Amino acid sequence: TYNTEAFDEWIRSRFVELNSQLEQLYYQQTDRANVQEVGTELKHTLESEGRELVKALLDEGNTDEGFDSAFDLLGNVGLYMAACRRHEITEPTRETTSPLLEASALAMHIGASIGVTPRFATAHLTTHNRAHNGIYKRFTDLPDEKLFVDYNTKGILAYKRASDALLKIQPLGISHPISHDLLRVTKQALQDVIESNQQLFNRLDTDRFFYCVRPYYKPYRVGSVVYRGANAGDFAGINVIDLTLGLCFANEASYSQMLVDKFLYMMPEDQQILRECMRRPNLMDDFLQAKGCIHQDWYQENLKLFIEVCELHGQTAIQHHNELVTKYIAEPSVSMPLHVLLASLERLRDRRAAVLRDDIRTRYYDLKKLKDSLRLEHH
Amino acid sequence: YNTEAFDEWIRSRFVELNSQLEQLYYQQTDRANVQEVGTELKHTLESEGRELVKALLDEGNTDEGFDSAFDLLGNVGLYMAACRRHEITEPTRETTSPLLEASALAMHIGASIGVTPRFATAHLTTHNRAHNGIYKRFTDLPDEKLFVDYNTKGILAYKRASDALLKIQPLGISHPISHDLLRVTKQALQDVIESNQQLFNRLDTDRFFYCVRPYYKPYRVGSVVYRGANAGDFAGINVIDLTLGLCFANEASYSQMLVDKFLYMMPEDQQILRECMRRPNLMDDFLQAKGCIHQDWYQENLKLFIEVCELHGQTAIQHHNELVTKYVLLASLERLRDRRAAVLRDDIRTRYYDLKKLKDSLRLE
Amino acid sequence: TYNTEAFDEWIRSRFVELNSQLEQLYYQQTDRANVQEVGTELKHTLESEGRELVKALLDEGNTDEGFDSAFDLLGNVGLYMAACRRHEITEPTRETTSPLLEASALAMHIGASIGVTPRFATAHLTTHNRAHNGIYKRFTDLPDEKLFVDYNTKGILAYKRASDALLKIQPLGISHPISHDLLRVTKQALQDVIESNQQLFNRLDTDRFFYCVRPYYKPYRVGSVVYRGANAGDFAGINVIDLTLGLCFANEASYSQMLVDKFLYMMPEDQQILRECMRRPNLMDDFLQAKGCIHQDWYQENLKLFIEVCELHGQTAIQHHNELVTKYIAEPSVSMPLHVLLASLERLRDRRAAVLRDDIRTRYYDLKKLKDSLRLEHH
Amino acid sequence: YNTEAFDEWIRSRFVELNSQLEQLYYQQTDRANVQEVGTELKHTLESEGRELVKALLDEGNTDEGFDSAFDLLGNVGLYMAACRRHEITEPTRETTSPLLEASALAMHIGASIGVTPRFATAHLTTHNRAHNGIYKRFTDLPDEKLFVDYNTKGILAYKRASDALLKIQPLGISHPISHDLLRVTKQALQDVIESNQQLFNRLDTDRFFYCVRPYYKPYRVGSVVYRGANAGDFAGINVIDLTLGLCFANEASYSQMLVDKFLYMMPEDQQILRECMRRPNLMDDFLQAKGCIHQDWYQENLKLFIEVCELHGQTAIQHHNELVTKYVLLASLERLRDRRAAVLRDDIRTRYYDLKKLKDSLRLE
């Protein structure tokens, strides 16, 4: 694993220096978002040194060191390609196919060999970013990047705690007393998300993030195909909650399509779990079907807690869209299909908040029926 | 409708018969005696259950999915377990099981889905589906419900602890996020201490030993004798042992224990457990990071790491001096409790010294 | 499974009648490839009856009857959508999104839920086409369709026999005596393919196939995304042979991309096996590395048989391209990106035949070195 | 390098020591005796192997992948099996295994990958990697090579038969393509008959019973006794039994047999086998298609189907009267051979009548 080590050590050293030093130049500019005619020397070094190290890896050909080893390597290749994209060394709408031949072949080889997208994925920097003596992979040494990544990690892990609790209710049923504890575990995990997102909101520098962090999550070509950038939402957890709570519907083209466009962007194990939720029942419909149990102790106790969980999830979606996406994407973007991705994100936030709409299906009425169901039972 | 017919029976008459039978046993002076008592109730339980099982055995091969099959196997196991409790079947008395139909069915399902052909802990705890608030049980006794509910709470708390620990593996012990997982682990283990305490302060020692425990006895399935389920039949607890490095897979005593429980947990738990047997542990990781002693992450993470090991080892003594003390291989149970607690011993390998070295490693700071 | 049964029984009855009767009209025409202003009544019935049956299924929502049941249902939905595409009831370059709302949602739901493409796949009509009292799913009752499907099935099954034998050599090694038998089993299976393809070549009606069979394998939209038609080559087997024999290379963008574009078009189990071959060694390189064993009995005996297998595979690719694709696609198409897909198919045939080229990597030299290696050893 | 050091030993000195030892045993008059003979060679085999194993046990947890671990377990099992053959270790003589290091290592790997902690058939047959033409073996005797090679050929032929049969399931018995799979199945089963015949006509009855078979004896791993491998330890053969409907998973006798062999085959073979236990079979399918008697597919497919059942049942008698006849649970071996052959019996359920009904069903045509 000499060649593999050599590339990783490069990613954890010079790679960070080159990008950092390059970000310094971009920030000094007046445009700040411009990359043309700047750091031309640093770009050649980053491209050159990375390619050689990658080329050494591409020579070894087929290797089977296990999923973790392969995924880690693919991450470095993706981190490398992502940087080249940020610095305009490679640009999709400018090419017909990727100019980074070696890296593309290697990335497409590993990705297809382990069932993941042939590029940098969220897990590469968050849940599966191995730290060496305290430092883990990063594009730059900027404090704002670390804040973004760490809080995405905290957020993601909090959602996993919430989806795991929800999945354990399935075998017990909504009337099970133990389901009341899982429901509370779920509630706490979702609150950890609200808190996690708040801290990020109160510490991340809006400007530094939009000009020095975000530009590394851009779409770029791998081979001839264009692959979009990773999202902090690329993991089963969040969608597992949507389906299990019944807030979203797999039978709707809009939602299933979204799942399809993200499967390869998460771990194989997360894909398996997500797909399975698409053919399992949900708690919403369960409670709705238990109308003749309205005067049951477990019903009032569990429905009450359930409804609270549905609200927290919707709260977390409003917090994300209304606050996070708003303060670091929409605003800085108006100053410097954007209105399209914003509109999709809205239907998503409203789908979780269960608001009233006529253009899309929502649980507003179902949730209201259940809320008004708890009224009749407190007697 | 046969599956449901049997399930509905298990959730109704089955509970009545056992309950009514437990009433007779308790009135006795011996109370542990079952000979010449409830002979009528025993015949009914055996008879009604067999007929319902026989109807199922006729359908032959069925593939309704893992959950459906496991649930059915649970009812068959619950039925056979009852028969064992009431002496309708007794291992040291037989050469092979007298419950022919139930045995065939149980062995068929179990082997078909990779689980033991009898009632397993998950059948009554994590995978016990409730209907309108009531879930499978042997009797309607309050002490059974206390035992099962707290075993469930305990088990689920351990799963939260093992899941947090496994997420550190890809991040490493020096990762800042590993400090949060380590704290999540600490909290989950505390939930176990609290969970066990509540059980200790509410369960009726007598009712449990004469009306609850006798349903977890060993009985024959076919010609083979299969031991009773244990609240410790799940990956979680052993995942923590290996990940924290408190136990060693390279030791016959421990790997044998794992082998004797694999079939007693869910296939998914088996997969996870086996995997931990070929993965590194945090203990050795910290020990190998001696040249990082003056690192911020080393001081912070290690402290919590040691607090985690102490909560686990300590939560071990509590259990050891409870379901084992108040109620052959006694030594094998002491070594297990000693490895977890990392006590000092000369007969078995322990982390006592390694843990002390690490505790005193925080000293310099 | 009433609604599921109702739809299947429809697919096996009226569906076949409507398409058949419709094919009769198209054939009578002078253009014969025209579909405008013809069978307008039959089209409305096919579209109408199918949609209603699908709509009934879409209502049931999430169901978990097992992989086989779900895959079978998805097949009927795909068969239905494919027909609508053939009859121009739906056309990709004419739409922005699919006009078949219910069918799209259902197809995308099942597909994503079990990890397969949301449309009709080769297995749906070949290896996983269940027959009822002798009759299995089909678009029409035409004899030429049955010939096409049956021989694709025979061909596919023969390739599976060849890939399975090759994979069993891996744990034994190329010098193992038992590997000589597997190598012979492989040789026989590949010959069954040559024979299978020959029979198809000598019995299929070139015209009927191009105007009455092939038009059902066209690309159509599912939701907003366009999904290409199934190919008799959508299964692990063929590519497993390519990689195990070392005739193709996973480290090349061109090949890995091709694998990615077909994974969802085969069974999950075939995907698993294929991906794994991308990180395993191959026999070609093994033999090349055993140069200091040239005077070994197993070497001459096994290398000789190996080289024969490589030739048969290449023979089967030439037979397919030069004969089959030529007589039923290229010619009838010149009479009535086509030159693009033909060019890709050529690089593929030459990759297996191991011919000499400068534009792509081939085993021509490696195979020649090994052939000339057997000469030195027969002494 | 420890893994390779042990493997290279198994492929060199290990073979020499055992071979040289077999020479001494054969010269004797008893020939089956091992007491007071080759005492020097035994010490060397035990000593050299243990040291190499001890080096491996030190590395602790390793995750080099299933193939690497399984291969290593095989060497450890081959080593322990030899020690058993030479009486260096004997089950009915011990309470626990005297080979401490080897036991721990074997139990560790086996449990970590889900296989029995000893030498399994695949270790010498389908998964025995050859180096420059030579693959793992206990001795250099020609009769061992004959036994192993033909077991391998037999096994691979059965895998071809089970794979063809499983591909009919999704197509159905009335599918035209099922007629080809049925013929592929027929040919594969014939390859088995031929394979077994060659073994019968070449293997030296004496050399095999005194120099080959004694290496497949049962021995202790830890404290548990694990039986020796059988050329029948793989899914294939049992997949054919269930798919053809010749055997029944709902019968304790058969499901128990499956349970006692799962760990003796590859995890992938276990998965496939278990699944067959909850799937339909062709026998019952044909029986249920009585109102299709005058169908073309019914006549053609059924004929070949019956020829397949007869080849299997007949290939059973051959084996039964060979490795069992020429060389307790003898009855359980008769019933198995009788279910496969579908003979007439009153003590166990068989397909004799069902098969006769189907044979006479072709009569009307």
Ligand code: HEM
């Ligand atoms: C200021 C920081 C953040 C910003 C600027 C941000 C921005 C975005 C953007 C613009 C998208 C849309 C997808 C695309 O077109 O690529 C997205 C998706 C998503 N984000 Fe964030 N994000 C932030 C933090 C977080 C955190 C901490 C979480 C927690 C896990 C998270 C979870 C998600 C989810 C789950 C999705 C998908 C939509 C859905 O299914 O509802 N994000 N984010």
Ligand code: HEM
């Ligand atoms: C006259 C009958 C047949 C014709 C017209 C035909 C045509 C084609 C076409 C045009 C393609 C290109 C893919 C696309 O753009 O969709 C293709 C692919 C393929 N065909 Fe056929 N085919 C026939 C029979 C068969 C049979 C019997 C087999 C046997 C399994 C088969 C195996 C393949 C393979 C494996 C591929 C992929 C290319 C590769 O990886 O080499 N085809 N076929």
